Ligand binder design. Sequence first.
Ligand SMILES: C[S@@+](CC[C@H](N)C(=O)[O-])C[C@H]1O[C@@H](n2cnc3c(N)ncnc32)[C@H](O)[C@@H]1O
Ligand SMILES: C[S@@+](CC[C@H](N)C(=O)[O-])C[C@H]1O[C@@H](n2cnc3c(N)ncnc32)[C@H](O)[C@@H]1O
Ligand SMILES: C[S@@+](CC[C@H](N)C(=O)[O-])C[C@H]1O[C@@H](n2cnc3c(N)ncnc32)[C@H](O)[C@@H]1O
Ligand SMILES: C[S@@+](CC[C@H](N)C(=O)[O-])C[C@H]1O[C@@H](n2cnc3c(N)ncnc32)[C@H](O)[C@@H]1O
Lengths: 338, 338, 333, 338, 57
Amino acid sequence: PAVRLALQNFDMTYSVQFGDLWPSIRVSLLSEQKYGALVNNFAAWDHVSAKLEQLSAKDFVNEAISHWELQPSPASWACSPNLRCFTFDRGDISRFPPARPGSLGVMEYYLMDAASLLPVLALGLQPGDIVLDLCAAPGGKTLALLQTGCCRNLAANDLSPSRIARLQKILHSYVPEEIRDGNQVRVTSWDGRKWGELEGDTYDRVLVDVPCTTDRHSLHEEENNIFKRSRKKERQILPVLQVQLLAAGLLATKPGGHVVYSTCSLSHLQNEYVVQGAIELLANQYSIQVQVEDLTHFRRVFMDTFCFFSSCQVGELVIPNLMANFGPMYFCKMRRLT
Amino acid sequence: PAVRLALQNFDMTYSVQFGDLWPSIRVSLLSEQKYGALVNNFAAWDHVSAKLEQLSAKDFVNEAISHWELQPSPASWACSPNLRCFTFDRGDISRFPPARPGSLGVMEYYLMDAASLLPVLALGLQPGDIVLDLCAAPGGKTLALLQTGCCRNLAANDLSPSRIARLQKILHSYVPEEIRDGNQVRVTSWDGRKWGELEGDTYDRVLVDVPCTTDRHSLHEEENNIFKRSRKKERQILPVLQVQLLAAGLLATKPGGHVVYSTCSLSHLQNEYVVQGAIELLANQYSIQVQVEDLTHFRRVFMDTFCFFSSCQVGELVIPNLMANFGPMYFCKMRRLT
Amino acid sequence: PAVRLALQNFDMTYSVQFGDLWPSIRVSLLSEQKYGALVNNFAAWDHVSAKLEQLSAKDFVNEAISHSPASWACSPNLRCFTFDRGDISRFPPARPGSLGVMEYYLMDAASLLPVLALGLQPGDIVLDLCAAPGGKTLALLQTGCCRNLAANDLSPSRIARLQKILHSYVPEEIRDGNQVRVTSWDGRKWGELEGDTYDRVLVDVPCTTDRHSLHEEENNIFKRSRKKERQILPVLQVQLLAAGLLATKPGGHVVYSTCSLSHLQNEYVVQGAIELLANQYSIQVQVEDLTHFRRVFMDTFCFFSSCQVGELVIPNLMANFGPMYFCKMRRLT
Amino acid sequence: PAVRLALQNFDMTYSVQFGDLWPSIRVSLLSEQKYGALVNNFAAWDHVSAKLEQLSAKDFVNEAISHWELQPSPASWACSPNLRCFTFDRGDISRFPPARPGSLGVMEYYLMDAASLLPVLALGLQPGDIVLDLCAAPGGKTLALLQTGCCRNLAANDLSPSRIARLQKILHSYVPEEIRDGNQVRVTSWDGRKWGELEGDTYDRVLVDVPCTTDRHSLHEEENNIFKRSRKKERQILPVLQVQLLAAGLLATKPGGHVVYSTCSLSHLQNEYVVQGAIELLANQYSIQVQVEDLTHFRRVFMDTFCFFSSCQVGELVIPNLMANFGPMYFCKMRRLT
Amino acid sequence: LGRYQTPDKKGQTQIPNPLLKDILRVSEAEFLARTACTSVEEFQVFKKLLAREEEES
Ligand SMILES: C[S@@+](CC[C@H](N)C(=O)[O-])C[C@H]1O[C@@H](n2cnc3c(N)ncnc32)[C@H](O)[C@@H]1O
Ligand SMILES: C[S@@+](CC[C@H](N)C(=O)[O-])C[C@H]1O[C@@H](n2cnc3c(N)ncnc32)[C@H](O)[C@@H]1O
Ligand SMILES: C[S@@+](CC[C@H](N)C(=O)[O-])C[C@H]1O[C@@H](n2cnc3c(N)ncnc32)[C@H](O)[C@@H]1O
Ligand SMILES: C[S@@+](CC[C@H](N)C(=O)[O-])C[C@H]1O[C@@H](n2cnc3c(N)ncnc32)[C@H](O)[C@@H]1O
């Protein structure tokens, strides 16, 4: 029912947005998704990389960086480094086996939607950055932010204390005790919208991977479905929350710092209008100027692995396709100027 | 008489402890003390801050945080945030006028010994913490703990129901009804020593600002003076109580949580002897390991405003000086490990 | 004593609501109030207007209407003169003109705003549910839009004052016959009698009359004996507003108003009556935005712009126009 | 006969209330009830807890508290602490052996309807509270209120001096002389309805576990049965008495204090009607505002052990089921505001 | 404005009143900026209102 209401709502809204492209997306959302194996750098990545190559999988992030020169600055200056994520070839539907603990106890790799790595990559972490993950749980992107080896400090926050337990489980599974308990990582459970007041102008890089209508998940799971009749108000006020969280992320960013906003939804209402809305709110209410940064070179380099909806005005959008079934992933990089 | 017995007792003890430094302290204890104006964040702090700057006063907490980078982690990760406390320059004896109600019918600022803010700052509240102020009345440090905007929950306890009335008066004067009537604040009147049994392993941060010989107050007020002949036993058994309260605070702290112990006395028998005494009691009787955390960077940053007795083995001590007459304030941060 | 209990209660309540704005209001409530001269259109308004201009007074309504696009609605033909911002001059008492009717009515200029905001159109069936002593009733008539005007008030003694004003300001040709109807009955019962009848309804409810409660000791709502009556005042107010809405035709409009700064008697009563009609009667009521109306009249009055529902004129020494809360609504279903 | 009149009356009334749920309740009321073993904290609870675990029984108050975080404030803030009550698994019909005097000559545990602990738990005692049990005899809930270790003072009242003897027997059997013979526990045998006049605005927490039609007991015992023909008037005027006692409890509560009203009846006339009636009576006659507090989180956490009739408008209701045969237990938490 | 309470009966107020010098000795601009905390225009009107209050009786 909620699964059917979600599909009913997407047929109305997304047939209009994508037009003749909507069927190819619709079939992909209703079929098995493609995963990437994010290699754990704490678990001796060279052996894991070699092991994953035996399956005929290839690191799409390395493939991308190789062509960074083709078609301004080194890939490391633009794109977050040391992220190795293996995927099978275009059209291949093979599944990675479950990860296992290595000689060091930590798990070899983390299976995830390969597109979920793009907001982290696009955020462009540089060595020594103070980083904030405002909506961090269950920790997929938090894990990737750590893998870069650039975080001087990493703040991971999420309002839900139950999802924070899953984030702690991932940190204990993949990260050595030396790092996860020191002053390098800090896990909090608090409203992300209040970050403007507490910890303003503090972070170099901020990830705002907001709660959204989780388009693909809302078509599979019936429990805790945002399209439930009872959750009608919660779903309609979702773009308010999303702007409030993005604005809080921007207020927590140092002047000159950068922010990546992202969702796993196809709706314009939760994507470009949240970016435009938060930029207006900061310009009017706080007199802070925020510039959207162009990710066209980033897109063009990663087009070899993902299907992008190139008609995006603000930010970029990965649309699912059967050839590369990487779920809806919207993302927009911004720079706080004043 | 009790005022003279207090001074007589301090001449015997503190001349030995501080040596040639005791006169400079003695004259300061027998002269007018310096106050800081803790800005009320519920009362539109920006206008209050601007109004206090007109008097030539400056926020010592902001001055301190600015130099946090000079000579590991952001100031917000180490030091409790959003605390704005104005003081006059070193050597200035100007007095702040009484605060008046402002922005939400709440008092604009709270006048207090500026040093009383240091145990609260040193405790290092992070967003979403469950906090306990075991010996909270009359509420100066309770008020500061609230001002951070980090307390998910704040337990304020004090054995005396008469002093709790003063704490309730401050909460009604400074905090809006929205916060002080909800599940965010809880005022109790019970023996703090019993917190090991009721509410064990519950709090992230615990303040144990124990009853002591209140050295400065004991030299001014004759009523309810601890140095009265009838209160000889009560005063001699004071280090037993102080260990019992600190141990109870540590037992109510979650494993991994932090505790700040503090007094407003120069006596080592109430300060370092209580920290060592409570750490031993928990390791022997309960098999719980407690680590004293180093506040040398914290001290060094705040040395610009306060006179510290740098010869402290465990914890830190602010000694009163005519240039900065901030009363005796001992404080020690600890981490419960097991 | 009751005057001191009133101020004591205000200090507690209103220092919290207005914060650092409360002193400027407090001094204004404890000082002489500013009046506006509502011109009587039945007494040859052109000569009265000219006479009032000689004093350096200006029709604030004419100034407001001249100024934003004409999207906002506003009741017409209301000419009310006030002195400039900062001027404390007093209007002389009004006198009967050439047609034996009074030239103008002195009143709190802000009391005209709920009538203006109600947006009377030609040929409307209008109801003034708590009409006495008749200041706003008089203004409703001045528009020349009322096909019919029902003026009600529970007190028969205050209705005598309303009849005195109607006889003093309105010619017998317009009072009688079927254009005006003065009743003295419980306004809360209008849902049953005369439901879905009126195009426009004014519900200027009984409240703690903040300014009056600091001047007059007799019949003071803050007296020790009147403790229950004062505490149950927001119940009555919701009952009267709900009755006003039930007597409004579907599609019709209602203005609720008070002369209190209390949020308990202002917004909470609007919020309460809308819930009561939605739950008990399944009637939908929409609060209409008066931001354009406010912005146009901000040149004459001090408004507390932080108002969630409705608008509030707060007294200030520059324009000492007493507390005046008002909210426009539309009954949809 | 009175047992048959009770069942006859319940068939008429409760078939309408519960509908198709009434048979499952009816069979449970006419079968053996399930008991919980409330551990005596004065008799070394750790050994008793260990002993009760050998039987395959488990503490449901602990199981419940563990999931308090899942799906605002710590469990201790919301829910009365230190209550350990063991029950057998869902579907298990094992019986606890009788309680025996242990170490200090006191009883090890108290067998009771596990649901009878929920009004005490829901009342949310905090350390140092002044507590009143207006209808305390025979003392099951009084005993639990003491077990928390939160009562500064505990007033236990009951009109019947014969049932007070049973309460004194329980206090002597379970509570050591140090506490029962002190200013901590006060047993009175006066009319509970008169508490508005004597001891008004005094208590922080008040339990009003009123006399009702004791649905389950009235189907077993023929002696002193409320459904006897002679007790027709007494039974019909029972909701008047119930409102009078609840209103008296509320009048004895301090402004801001909390009250739990409870019955062991399924009849809405004795449950929600009495709650609304007492709230109306206080609002009209005394101009006191009383807010019903939502126990949905409390219910949801305890649903794992008890069957609740979730269609309850005000308060909560535990309905008996063969899987968990815990007798009718209605309870509603309130806060006196003015 | 509520910034000056009359002391009674023990010569005590809820909040201490401003110092006589900060009320009278100081300039009108400083009185309004630090003590009264109101605009200049508002006090000019107050002076006119009070003048009229005194003139009558
Ligand atoms: C899409 S998830 C984040 C996914 C995560 N970054 C990852 O890659 O594993 C969005 C999150 O927002 C959280 N959330 C919702 N409201 C919040 C708020 N006000 N502040 C912070 N987090 C919030 C939800 O609990 C949810 O975990
Ligand atoms: C120095 S005062 C606390 C000052 C307070 N934190 C402030 O900053 O305003 C010490 C307090 O310990 C309280 N106290 C004494 N014995 C106690 C006990 N056993 N448990 C709890 N509080 C106790 C005293 O009543 C006194 O208020
Ligand atoms: C603020 S006065 C109305 C002022 C009037 N509209 C004017 O501008 O001159 C409020 C009125 O409500 C009246 N009233 C009180 N209870 C009433 C009720 N139940 N029904 C109708 N009028 C009532 C009072 O007698 C009082 O005259
Ligand atoms: C259900 S029992 C209380 C059970 C008790 N709280 C327990 O858990 O053991 C209800 C009690 O109300 C008592 N009672 C009846 N009328 C009373 C009155 N007017 N005032 C006080 N108690 C009364 C009865 O004697 C009876 O013991």
